[PDB]
């Protein structure tokens, strides 16, 4: 039908009209009774996640008019006594807690002494709402109201305030843990034949859980050592133990995106050990590639520190990607090779000077193809697509194409191609050595040019 | 009409 959604937003507008009416007259308890009535509409189970999201956004806008009314009223000396207590009289819990969160943040601004206790309270009292959808949105409304007022390091030095960065990290990590719980819970509610619909519904709501990780990175006081010891520790605990592929895949990529590259370098071995622990249905390849891609862009960015010499990227990634693929049960051959592609790409962008690394990827790629007892690999096959794309990177990226001819294991990979692809790939490399002019060739590289012609003709 | 069930004290 989708009438429900409209009927609800009608009733919202009716009650939020009479809300602001009472706010103009300074009839506060009459205002909050309509605020409660408005918030009554968030108690529904009939609305889908998309419909409900729209209804939440509507009601969130109206609550903001009430929030600012209170904030100003309190700031001009005319503070309402026992308002924190009073809103808790509401019989239904959803209205009660949205109102409690609203009144809460006002109290934090107006009474800095009570900040630690109130934040710690608001996050803990949300345990009331066990329903996945409504609880997710409640705990999201908690996170957004509190955005500005959480403890941090670059703060006003008012020495009657309470709570530090450690309380902020516990606050958000707890709300995170609870929101991920509710979101994984969604997988098992309802009837068993709507498994594809649920996973579509859960996907829509991934942003709500992800906001916690975002909120943690926005804390100025989260330095690299707090990230190492508290925040990533906090997150990885939830991620590996949730035993849910959708959540694992989303959140691991969400980490990569949200925190800076400074932190990623100091936490590589923990992150990649986590990748190996994920659910089999998780696309581990996409996590590792995305991480490598972010570190590539960090190497080329000047007016920045670059990569430390003590952090041996290639030695870490080569060794871990290997260990990750070991932990997979049935990884496609095409995927293994897509990682060899990005390992080259890592070595090229993070160590241009070190050609020996590029050849060690290729040597290890040969070992992969040699170890895999492989049937003749067609050009239509996906493995060939990737080995084509692998080999084109040294050719297309390097300045001097003579330097590619000095790679020892570049040519042995041609053995595993199709007849059709040997002819095309040999043509492509030789075609580039003419498109840019040739200097005199050294002993090793005269050998390579003839080997490229022998595969072309035969 | 509505089914009430007293929660037993546990051993």
């Amino acid at each position: 039908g989708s009438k429900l959604l409209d009927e609800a937003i009608q009733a919202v507008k009716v009650q939020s009209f009479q809300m602001k009416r009472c706010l103009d007259k300074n009839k506060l308890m009459d205002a909050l009774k309509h605020a409660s009535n408005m918030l009554g509409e968030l108690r529904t189970s009939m609305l889908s996640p998309k419909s409900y999201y729209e209804l939440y956004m509507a009601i969130s806008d109206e609550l903001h008019y009430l929030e600012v009314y209170l904030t100003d009223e309190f700031a001009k000396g005319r503070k309402v006594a026992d308002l924190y207590e009073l809103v808790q009289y509401a019989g239904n819990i959803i209205p009660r807690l949205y109102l409690l969160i609203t009144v809460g943040v006002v109290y934090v601004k107006s009474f800095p002494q009570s900040r630690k206790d109130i934040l710690k309270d608001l996050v803990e009292m949300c345990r009331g709402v066990q329903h996945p959808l409504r609880g997710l949105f409640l705990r999201n409304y908690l996170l957004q109201c509190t955005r500005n007022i959480l403890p941090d390091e670059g703060e006003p030095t008012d020495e009657e305030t309470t709570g530090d960065i450690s309380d902020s990290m516990d606050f958000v990590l707890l709300n995170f843990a609870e929101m991920n719980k509710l979101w994984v819970r969604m997988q098992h509610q309802g009837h068993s034949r709507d498994r594809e619909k649920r996973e579509r519904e859960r996907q829509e709501l991934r942003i709500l859980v992800g906001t916690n990780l975002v909120r943690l990175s926005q804390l100025e006081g989260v330095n690299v050592e707090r990230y190492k010891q508290i925040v990533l520790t906090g997150i990885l605990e939830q991620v590996v133990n949730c035993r849910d592929a959708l959540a694992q895949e989303y959140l691991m990529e969400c980490i990569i995106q949200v925190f800076p590259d400074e932190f990623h370098l100091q936490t590589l071995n923990p992150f990649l050990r986590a990748c190996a622990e994920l659910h089999q249905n998780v696309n581990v390849k996409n996590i590792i590639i995305a991480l490598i891609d972010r570190l590539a862009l960090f190497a080329h960015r000047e007016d920045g520190p670059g990569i430390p010499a003590d952090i041996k990227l290639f030695d870490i990634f080569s060794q871990q990607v290997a260990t990750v693929i070991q932990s997979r049960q049935d990884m496609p051959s095409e995927d293994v090779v897509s990682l060899q592609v990005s390992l080259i790409n890592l070595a090229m962008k993070c160590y241009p000077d070190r050609v020996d690394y590029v050849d060690k990827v290729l040597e290890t790629t040969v070992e992969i193809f040699n170890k895999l007892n492989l049937e003749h690999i067609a050009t239509s096959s996906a493995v060939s697509k990737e080995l084509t794309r692998l080999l084109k990177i040294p050719v297309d990226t390097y300045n001097n194409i003579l330097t590619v001819l000095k790679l020892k294991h570049f040519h042995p990979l041609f053995e595993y191609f199709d007849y059709e692809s040997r002819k095309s790939m040999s043509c492509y490399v030789l075609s580039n050595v003419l498109d840019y002019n040739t200097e005199i060739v050294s002993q090793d590289q005269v050998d390579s040019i003839m080997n490229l012609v022998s595969t072309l003709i035969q | 009409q509505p089914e009430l069930y007293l929660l037993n004290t546990m051993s």
Binding site: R43, E85, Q88, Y89, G91, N92, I93, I94, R96, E124, M125, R127, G128, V129, Q130, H131, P132, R134, G135, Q189 | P2, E3, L4, Y5, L6, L7, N8, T9, M10
Partner: protein, 293 residues
């Protein structure tokens, strides 16, 4: 014509003395002077003479302080537990308006004023002018509250309850005895959950028990329904309770008042499953009126 005389009572401390409110039938709220056990009641009885020229032949005037319990709206069942008389005038006449002083010394008031369903307990001053066939009578009601201090012992109520191999829960309320503006701080902890729970609520229930022995009526009234959980928990899930009693204006617990009636309060924890089946556990709490400092 009208009435020949109109009796008015005025307490000596009628300006400074604090009043109190009482919820009667159909939501009405009467306000009367507040008294405590041991206080003296004293003031003036003022007779306004309305019909000048006429005369009022009486066989005496008195004033009574009364405290009584009324059961089932039945005049014949009323029992006075406190009666004090002051004779104000011998048999005589009244041509004009007069006023009489009265003082009841250090009056015992052993019970708190109550208005319920099958029981009222009230105090009043009753002025009576005795006449040949029909007495002029005027009542003047007073509230009495009974105070108490923080109790010697006040143990938290803590209890595991359940349905065998379906639902086990442990609940805890922070006290056994709560004052009238106190707060139920508590928690529900789920040990085993093999049913699908829709919501859980804490209720505050008022029982009013009247009569003696097998003569026992009970009147139940649910004063609060307070949702505390929305949705299905799993094992290891804690649910916080914070229920403020100021919002429901209850009376104190009253236990075997004059061996006639009781009024007792109960926290009724109620869970409700997806098929609307309802699981509950009742626990008595004592409510008490805190003495202000």
């Amino acid at each position: 014509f009208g009435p020949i005389c109109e009796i008015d009572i005025v307490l000596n401390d009628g300006e400074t003395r604090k009043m109190a409110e009482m919820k009667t039938e159909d939501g009405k709220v009467e306000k009367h002077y507040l008294f405590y056990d041991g206080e003296s009641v004293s003031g003036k009885v003022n007779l306004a003479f309305k019909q000048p020229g006429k005369r009022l032949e009486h066989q005496g005037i008195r004033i009574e302080f009364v405290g009584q319990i009324e059961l089932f709206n039945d005049k014949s069942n009323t029992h006075e537990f406190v009666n004090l008389v002051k004779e104000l005038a011998l048999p005589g006449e009244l041509t004009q308006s007069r006023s009489y002083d009265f003082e009841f010394m250090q009056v015992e008031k052993p019970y708190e004023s109550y208005i319920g369903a099958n029981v009222r307990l009230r105090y009043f001053l009753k002025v009576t002018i005795v006449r040949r066939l029909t007495d002029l009578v005027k009542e003047y009601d007073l509230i009495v509250h009974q105070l108490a201090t923080y109790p010697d012992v006040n143990n938290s109520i803590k209890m595991e309850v359940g349905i065998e191999d379906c639902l086990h829960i442990e609940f805890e309320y922070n006290k056994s005895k709560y004052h009238l503006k106190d707060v139920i701080v508590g928690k529900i902890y789920f040990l085993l959950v093999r049913i699908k729970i829709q919501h859980m609520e804490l209720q505050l229930i008022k029982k009013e028990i009247t009569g003696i022995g097998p003569s026992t009526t009970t009147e139940t009234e649910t004063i609060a329904k307070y949702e505390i959980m929305d949705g299905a928990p799993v094992k290891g899930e804690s649910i916080p309770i914070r229920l403020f009693l100021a919002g429901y204006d209850p009376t104190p617990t009253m236990r075997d008042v004059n061996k006639k009636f009781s009024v007792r309060y109960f926290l009724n924890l109620v869970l409700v499953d997806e098929e609307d089946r309802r699981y509950f556990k009742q626990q008595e709490i004592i409510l008490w009126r805190k003495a202000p400092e």
